[PDB]
């Protein structure tokens, strides 16, 4: 069982070597898994879903850690943006 | 185990358009409400202008919802995933 509401991140990826290119799925898959590993080693457990060729969702086991994860991701070269969202309605 | 559904939405009156956020927001709310009136509680996370995640913390209810959603005119696709953290 979890403590707290469910939060996730959306994480955009840009390859600076090809900056206007959105169809970079291999690169997004590579780097999101690396970031997941680095976050795991900082004691932040999350599940990754690659939902576009250049965008992924990180779902947290503990939503309290969403800000630590956003802060980490925004330090990474290939992260273009990061937003945090909770549930859309009231269910 | 918590289960979730990835739900794709299509507006047949705006065929081949993904920029249908108002329609997606309306219909995901309606489906959530209809399921709640039959005792299935879920949370919606809208993830694109035509896609949402429905999360079922009573996990088994996800298969009931999947059956309900796949027969909706405005649902293009529904896939089911389990919540799982490496460890
Ligand atoms: Cl590391
Ligand atoms: Cl994962
Ligand atoms: Cl944000
Ligand atoms: Cl909700």
For residue B58, the domain's CATH number is: 3.30.70.260
Number of domains in chain A: 1
Whether residues B36 and A91 touch (CB distance < 8 A) is answered with yes
Ramachandran quadrant class, B39 (left: phi over 0; alpha: psi -120 to 50; beta: rest): left
Burial (CB count <10 Å: 0-12, 13-18, 19+), residue B59 = middle
Range of the domain at A84: 1-91
Residue A87 and residue B25: Cβ atoms within 8 Å? Answer: no
Please give the order of strands across the beta sheet that includes A79-85. A46-52, A55-60, A8-13, A79-85
**Conformation bin of residue A10: beta by default, left when phi > 0, alpha when psi is -120 to 50:** beta
Q: Is the CB of A6 less than 8 angstroms away from the CB of B43?
A: yes
Nominal resolution in Å? Answer: 1.4
B55 forms beta bridges with B4, B43
> A58: nearest CA in chain B?
B85
Elucidation technique = X-ray
List the Cα angle A12/A17/A25 in 5-degree steps: 45
Terminal CA-CA length for chain A: 18
Cα distances (angstroms) measured from residue A85 to each of A13, A20, A77, B1, B6: 18, 26, 22, 22, 16
Q: In angstroms, rounded to a whole number, what is the distance separating the alpha carbons of residues B35 and B13?
A: 25
């Amino acid at each position: 069982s979890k403590k707290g509401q469910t939060l996730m991140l959306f994480v955009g990826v840009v390859d600076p070597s090809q900056p206007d290119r959105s169809d970079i799925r291999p690169f997004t898959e590579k780097w999101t898994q690396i970031w997941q590993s680095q976050l795991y080693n900082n004691h932040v457990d999350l599940q990754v879903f690659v939902i576009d060729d250049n965008r992924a969702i990180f779902m947290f086991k503990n939503g309290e850690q969403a800000f630590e994860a956003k802060k980490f991701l925004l330090k990474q070269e290939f992260v273009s943006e990061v937003t945090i969202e909770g549930q859309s309605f009231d269910g």
